[PDB]
């Protein structure tokens, strides 16, 4: 994507999003990040959306295959899918590490990237067969949690989405359903108590995410 203008990559990432062409969207966003400039809020979201969708289809495929797995073909093909997923996670992690996280000074960008780092290590963990990967997820989430708690209101969408994913990590990956539940509940309760400060639009944004915490808690309790 070396020869395409940054702005052109961003414009094409948005078109690919409209076209539900998420692999293209991700390639364009990777090109953009690799221009070496920081991403705006909107660009970070594009990056996240693109790879979430790519890796989301790989995760869904991997789980179908894994379950079938329970001659060598099923294992081979699950390995193939698994390998591709891991390569996607490695390239997201690569982008974070070169050099999105280190140049992210604001709480907004830094928590976003650290959350993302935890997410992609969590995806790696889902297929790992592993403690180091889980610890890399935990550590990235934890650093993101510490900044978000210090630097963002409890209703901030990224703070909420970070806490939601960290709670999922706890439940699904760290075998700590109590930690998962305590986190989701504490997150929801503190957001609830901060809603009064919001405009109607921010209120809608936060409560939409709080409902996922609530749905998880209903699933878990």
């Amino acid at each position: 994507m070396g020869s395409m203008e940054r702005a052109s990559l961003i414009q094409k990432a948005k078109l690919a999003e409209q076209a539900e062409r998420y692999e293209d969207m991700a390639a364009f966003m990777k090109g953009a990040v690799e221009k070496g400039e920081e991403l705006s809020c909107e660009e970070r979201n594009l990056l996240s959306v693109a790879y979430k969708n790519v890796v989301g289809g790989q995760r869904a495929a991997w789980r179908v295959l894994s379950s079938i797995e329970q001659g060598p073909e099923v294992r081979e093909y699950r390995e193939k899918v698994e390998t591709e997923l891991q390569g996607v996670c490695d390239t997201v992690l690569g982008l974070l590490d070169s050099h999105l996280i280190k140049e992210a000074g604001d709480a907004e960008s830094r928590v976003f990237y650290l959350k993302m780092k935890g997410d992609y290590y969590r995806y790696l963990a889902e297929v790992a067969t592993k403690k180091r990967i889980i610890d890399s997820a935990r550590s990235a989430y934890q650093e993101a949690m510490d900044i978000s708690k210090k630097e963002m209101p409890p209703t901030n969408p990224i703070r909420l989405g970070l806490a939601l994913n960290f709670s999922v990590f706890h439940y699904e990956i760290a075998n700590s359903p109590e930690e998962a539940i305590s986190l989701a509940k504490t997150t929801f309760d503190e957001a609830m108590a901060d809603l009064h400060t919001l405009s109607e639009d921010s209120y809608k944004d936060s409560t939409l995410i709080m409902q996922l915490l609530r749905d998880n808690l209903t699933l878990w309790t």
Binding site: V49, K115, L160, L164
Partner: peptide, 6 residues
């Protein structure tokens, strides 16, 4: 369990 629907 739902994760952030980014």
């Amino acid at each position: 369990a739902m994760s952030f629907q980014s």
